[PDB]
């Protein structure tokens, strides 16, 4: 049978780096919403990287650096977003916790306080996989690997758009972009074209053991994160293909 | 293409955008340690066997580092299998087993490193660069633990909770990401056979084979972790590997000299 | 007068590595018993090493390595047992904590949560004492040094046998092995022959300042650990020769 | 004065006591790394510009370390400015921004260090000595991140939340406290001008100037962090610095050879 | 406007190294007073260095070492004082926490327990400022930088004298030393002569953003720390020149 | 005996089993750093004395490392005694004092190491191997803090809370476990006397003595931590130590050259 759930009562929330990139205008309402959620859920809040990782990719690729060099360079930006977000929640007892602490001591930290913040990137470092010159295991992927390894009650991905569309809704084909209320990871993996989530997220969903659904919701709309953590359908649901025991 | 066009895509598109992925693929290719060779010393196949296997290899490492820059990674072996068995029986997930296996590879690195310390060769961390550049320049070799640092973020296999990326994968990925010239796996068989030589009477030795040919023969999971074969097909820098028998005296030395002992597995 | 008690309310429990070696059949009932004890006691749970340390001793001795090399190699196996045991208690808020954390921050960690797990081996590393080729300061010894330094309310040693016998009850002289309900460390130190506890444990008992009795109980019998933590006599009591103030 | 009299004051008086301060000032002066040069490679001015700027400087570093012991610190640049902007807009204090800026300088150190690794030059921690003595003796150079380690204890500026002590200050303080012979800032302009050359048509080049003269001309915050100018006036060991254009091929090499390229800023 | 307060509910207490130097006679009553304050306040307790730093200054200066070498040598002594003080409060759940932990994880640690102890020295290390051969950014300075960066409710400096005098009240001009119940940092900075607080404390007070007053009180008089944490005037008040929003 | 018989006992018996203990005693004996000498520089006896004592020893270390591989450990001294006094008066246990003493030995290592840094000699961690193999191969010396890492797990003495295993023991144990060829304690007296020379008029110098003879003369706790004498009797590799006066110019140099200055204390 499947492995046990280590932290079955845990809710994992991944905050997009590009949400953080919007600054106070986006972060202050999200922090207020997170504050209200602290008494309702036990939260592991994981931040992605955003635009600064694109800059370091631009420099690193111009220098010729391999994908195992670019991966920790990008992960650093997710960590900086996590320190920023944690600083905003410090007065609620929330702090940033490092990867080794998340890996081995999360249980005690969530006993001390209602939420902690960490980096959503996984620590693949120079052991990132070759193939693409862009690190494949990024913030969505790391957050899901963690949530599923813990057997958490859910993973909610907080985006700067309503969810997944059939095309980039801020891109050249924006006009034909249709919103997808629900999809399966296997269907997404068959599609070509951009997504708001890592392609590697769909791969780790295929080998997942616990998380059956991940919702992508618009963190720029107050209340959607709160609704999503109660299972209300306010963004795109991704079925992982895990089925119940 | 151009740097401006790549930077534009990098700012404006998702990293998943195929157009962005294609422009990044045209970037220049820097090899960080192009003159170095990565060697994996097997845990079960070598270090677990003790003095009779390890001491001749220590002698070869010492002789080889005069003419060759070496990154020497260690396998895990029977103590990791014991830990995997305990943890798997408790229902623990692959990410938990990954950390347990890494401590066994660490133990093996420390034992090998202490035998090499009087020759100046240190044990260094495996996650990245650490003391590698300085040591490689001075004493021409370092020892590291071969387990990848994925810990709780280890990708599980399709079935079961055994971490699929273990010390073959760890050593291979470092060779690949440092752009090393050569990757040698040191095990306890002369190379790849058409069947497991320990449990087959009539296995035939294979001097050279591609990954695709291996898969067409059912040998996907044989002398190397099958995930390593797929990593090899995606590699930018290390497009073949050599598997040699570390129990044969001088086999590592001869492999470093360019002799075709063992099996050469090619990406294509 | 004697040094103060740093953590007088602490109960220290040492889990034998060979108990862990039995896998789920032994670990699951022990984890269930530990879960029930979390609301009753403030627990520092320390794991020993077991059979894997014997393997690394076999390899290390074959390579000629000195006792200061073998000590951290064995300690690593106690740490792995601790990570396994903590993972099983994670959903109760229990995590593994590293040696420096145990040494300097145990008070805050036991304020955050009811129990933590650590390695029972002491960090003697390459400063292990010479004499024997087998590291003398092992899991029982480290657990006692810690319990007595803290001035803890007790130390209970959880074994795969009922207690101490006059001979190895799984050994060649098993037939003449008589169970010892109670003994003194000084008497044990005078005896030759194997024990289920480190010989160095008897030495550190002689210089102990607080712990007057240590009970060795069979962790393979559910309820003995619970009884022992209430001071009920269900295994072998070792009198350390500390006397009350 | 005497050691006994200094020790008496040290035991009996507050450290604020002017008599104690004056006796401590008479102590002997040991230079820890007197033969080394500290170089700062600008973040915005050099590393952010990519290959065209960095690769020639890598070549100069490699050539220079044959005759010169080098401590090579990195700046932060545009990613730090982005982080400062986000955090400042949230109302975060200078001590929080300081830690964010340090991770960008760390990124730049890692990129530069990976280009130098095959030449044996490591990346080392910047807070102090670390692997510096051994590396300087063997491979004659190290790379470090230039941000000072003040973190939440960063002194704020008089106005705003931008950390006033950034990578110019970090590199300068290490040159000063190690007693290095020379401090070279590698930027993207030939040196100091009477006005910002990027936004002024008629700026005039200044080959040599004192800190006091700079302040009398409104140039307190120009090509160097103004706090660095005050640190320089208080320095015991590094009483002048040189600012050179790293985009000019050979400029670093020539500066290390004693050529007066760029601007020499003197404490007095 | 001014930066937000990260931990507005925090009280910071700096214990002079020379108070610790008096041993049990001073430390035991202070520990008893701290114990009684744990249920009243959320405390960050930061220890200074005291006489041992003067010894290492004497050796280091005799060896010719620069001020960036002496700064971490002195900071080590404040850390040792912090470990001593924390050990005395361990049974109350109080532990010493390292500088990186104070900088990034204080919120979670004060959620786990009522108080933590750390070093009052800031981690300037070899990046200490040149000019004086004595490290300028010492224990008072580090404690204030932290308290003001956090936006804490106060910083109270616990001394071995009643407060600031017009001369050293244990010095050669003791006879003309007049007690100063209240002063401003700017006035103190204009005075020449010794103070019981770092001169650099007055400099960081000038750029402070939150803390308006710091009281220096005699920790050798039981009850003054308790009174000072309630804002009662029992020592020297230093006005920083921050004014309310 | 045989490896199989040892492995059988190792699997089947308690480690306390005398038969297992006896088989392990027959194992081969590898010396990790057989050509190195461990030197302890006293805290109270040397470093606390400042320039007049330390600077000549720095000169000797620099001259000696041309012909000798050196591991240089530091003592703690008067600041540790102050900390022990404060903590003991509070009722704190030996395990707490042990950590306090280690920070003073660390301070002394940093001061000594900064005087040696321009000669390439680093300060390294004392718990084990760290940067020792690489540094010993290149610059022939390292500095480390001499306190053992036992921290809260320090064995207490029979009486009192002073840690019995301090920097003499720490340095000795590293010499023993690395299998070094020589162990030299550098103190402030010519060697062992029949009484404490600082408080006895008529003490007689002892050039050579065994541990047993020392105990029969009441000298168990004299110029060396008495626990070190018992460690020496149990040692496998270092069966004698030499105690020399570091205040005599050239005494360390001459001791390294094989001259019998000072006192030789033998295990038997
Ligand atoms: N099919 C799609 N559906 C929705 N958005 C898409 C799609 N394809 C591309 N996008 C783009 O992806 C953007 C989100 O960008 P991205 O996923 O890189 O940011 P992020 O998740 O905040 O960053 P990080 O991965 O660092 O956390 C959306 O604003 C949208 O423009
Ligand atoms: N077709 C094959 N050809 C050769 N060897 C095979 C084949 N199939 C299976 N094997 C077995 O695979 C083994 C190599 O894997 P093994 O795990 O022993 O190496 P290792 O590197 O020591 O692993 P670790 O280092 O993790 O302990 C060989 O000992 C061999 O018996
Ligand atoms: N006199 C004795 N009384 C009881 N058991 C003994 C005695 N002598 C030997 N033993 C053996 O010791 C075994 C326990 O082994 P051991 O003490 O090595 O394991 P452990 O305590 O689980 O391991 P660790 O020390 O790594 O925690 C018992 O099962 C028994 O066979
Ligand atoms: N009077 C002046 N003379 C020369 N340059 C000036 C002057 N005033 C302003 N500058 C500007 O200051 C810049 C140098 O500062 P800048 O922050 O770019 O350097 P940096 O070291 O790369 O910073 P970082 O390393 O933190 O990114 C020059 O590019 C120049 O445009
Ligand atoms: N103007 C002054 N008013 C009051 N005390 C003064 C003054 N000038 C000097 N002092 C001296 O300062 C002493 C306090 O010393 P100091 O400030 O060095 O100790 P501390 O604060 O305990 O140490 P640390 O800074 O390491 O925490 C007082 O006992 C007093 O003798
Ligand atoms: N019989 C004896 N012969 C020689 N010296 C003795 C004797 N008995 C006591 N001593 C004293 O022991 C001292 C050596 O111990 P001490 O602690 O000073 O050395 P240390 O290595 O500097 O200690 P640390 O390094 O921990 O400060 C000598 O200074 C000497 O005065
Ligand atoms: O990172 Mo922590 O381990 O808050 O107790
Ligand atoms: O190891 Mo921790 O220090 O749980 O806060
Ligand atoms: O130092 Mo800690 O981070 O008590 O959980
Ligand atoms: Mn996204
Ligand atoms: Mn046992
Ligand atoms: Mn003071």
UniProtKB/Swiss-Prot annotation, chains A, C, E:
It is found in: Cytoplasm. Induction: Requires molybdenum. Optimum pH is 6.5 to 7.0. Above pH 7.1 molybdenum is released. InterPro entries: AceGlu_kinase-like_sf, Asp/Glu/Uridylate_kinase, MoSto_subunit_alpha/beta. GO terms for cellular component: cytoplasm. GO terms for molecular function: molybdenum ion binding; nutrient reservoir activity. CDD domains: AAK_UMPK-MosAB (cd04255). Keywords: Cytoplasm, Metal-binding, Molybdenum, Storage protein. Octamer consisting of 4 alpha and 4 beta chains. Intracellular storage of molybdenum. Binds polyoxomolybdates. Can bind at least 90 molybdenum atoms per protein molecule. Belongs to the UMP kinase family. Highly divergent. This is Molybdenum storage protein subunit alpha. It comes from Azotobacter vinelandii (strain DJ / ATCC BAA-1303). The gene is mosA.
From Swiss-Prot, chains B, D, F:
Keywords: Cytoplasm, Metal-binding, Molybdenum, Storage protein. GO terms for molecular function: molybdenum ion binding; nutrient reservoir activity. Optimum pH is 6.5 to 7.0. Above pH 7.1 molybdenum is released. The keyword Chaperone does not apply. CDD domains: AAK_UMPK-MosAB (cd04255). Induction: Requires molybdenum. It is found in: Cytoplasm. It comes from the Bacteria. One of its GO terms (cellular component) is cytoplasm. Pfam families: AA_kinase (PF00696). The keyword Cytoplasm applies. Its main location: cytoplasm. Octamer consisting of 4 alpha and 4 beta chains. Intracellular storage of molybdenum. Binds polyoxomolybdates. Can bind at least 90 molybdenum atoms per protein molecule. Belongs to the UMP kinase family. Highly divergent. This is Molybdenum storage protein subunit beta. It comes from Azotobacter vinelandii (strain DJ / ATCC BAA-1303).
């Amino acid at each position: 049978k499947r492995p046990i759930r280590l932290l079955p009562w845990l809710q994992v929330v991944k905050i997009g780096g590009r949400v953080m990139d919007r600054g106070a205008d986006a972060i202050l309402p999200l922090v207020e919403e997170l504050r209200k959620l602290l008494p309702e859920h036990r939260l592991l809040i994981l931040t992605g990287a955003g635009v600064r990782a694109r800059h370091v990719f631009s420099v690193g690729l111009d220098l010729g650096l391999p994908v195992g060099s670019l991966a920790p360079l990008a992960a650093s930006e997710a960590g900086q977003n996590g320190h920023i977000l944690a600083a905003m929640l410090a007065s609620e007892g929330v702090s940033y916790v490092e990867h080794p602490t998340v890996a081995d001591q999360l249980a005690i930290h969530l006993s001390a306080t209602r939420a902690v913040v960490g980096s959503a990137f996984p620590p693949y470092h120079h052991h990132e996989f070759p193939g693409s010159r862009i690190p494949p295991h990024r913030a969505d992927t790391g957050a899901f690997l963690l949530a599923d390894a813990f057997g958490a009650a859910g993973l909610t991905i907080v985006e700067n758009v309503d969810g997944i569309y059939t095309a980039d809704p801020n891109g050249p084909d924006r006009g034909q972009a249709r919103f997808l209320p629900e999809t399966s990871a296997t269907d997404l993996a068959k599609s070509e074209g951009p997504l708001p989530v890592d392609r590697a997220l769909l791969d780790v969903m295929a080998t997942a053991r616990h998380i059956e659904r991940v919702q992508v919701v618009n963190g720029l709309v107050p209340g959607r994160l709160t609704a999503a953590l109660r299972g209300e359908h306010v963004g795109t649901l991704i079925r992982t293909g895990v089925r119940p025991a | 293409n151009s740097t401006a066009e790549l930077e534009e895509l990098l700012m404006q598109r998702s990293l998943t955008d195929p157009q962005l992925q294609a422009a990044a693929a045209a970037a220049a290719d820097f090899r960080i340690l192009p003159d170095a060779t990565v060697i994996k010393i097997g845990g079960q196949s070598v270090i677990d066997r003790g003095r009779a296997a390890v001491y001749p290899l220590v002698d070869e490492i010492v002789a080889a580092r005069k003419n060759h820059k070496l990154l020497i990674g260690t396998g895990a072996g029977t103590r990791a299998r014991h830990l995997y068995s305990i943890a798997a029986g408790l229902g623990l997930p692959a990410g938990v087993l990954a950390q347990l296996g890494s401590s066994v590879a660490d133990q093996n690195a420390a034992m090998l490193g202490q035998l090499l310390a009087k020759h100046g060769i240190p044990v260094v961390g495996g996650a990245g660069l650490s003391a590698v550049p300085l040591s490689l320049a001075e004493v021409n070799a370092v020892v590291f633990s071969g387990m990848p640092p994925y810990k709780l973020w280890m990708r599980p296999a399709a079935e079961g909770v055994i971490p699929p990326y273990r010390t073959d994968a760890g050593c291979f990925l470092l060779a690949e990401q440092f752009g090393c010239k050569q990757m040698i796996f040191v095990k306890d068989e002369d190379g790849l056979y058409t069947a497991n030589p320990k449990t087959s009477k009539d296995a035939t030795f294979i001097p050279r084979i591609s990954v695709d040919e291996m898969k067409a023969k059912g040998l996907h999971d044989s002398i190397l972790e099958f995930p390593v074969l797929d990593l090899l097909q995606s590699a930018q820098h290390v497009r073949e590997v050599q598997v040699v028998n570390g129990l044969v005296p001088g086999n590592l030395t001869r492999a470093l000299a360019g002799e075709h002992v063992g099996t050469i597995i090619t990406a294509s």
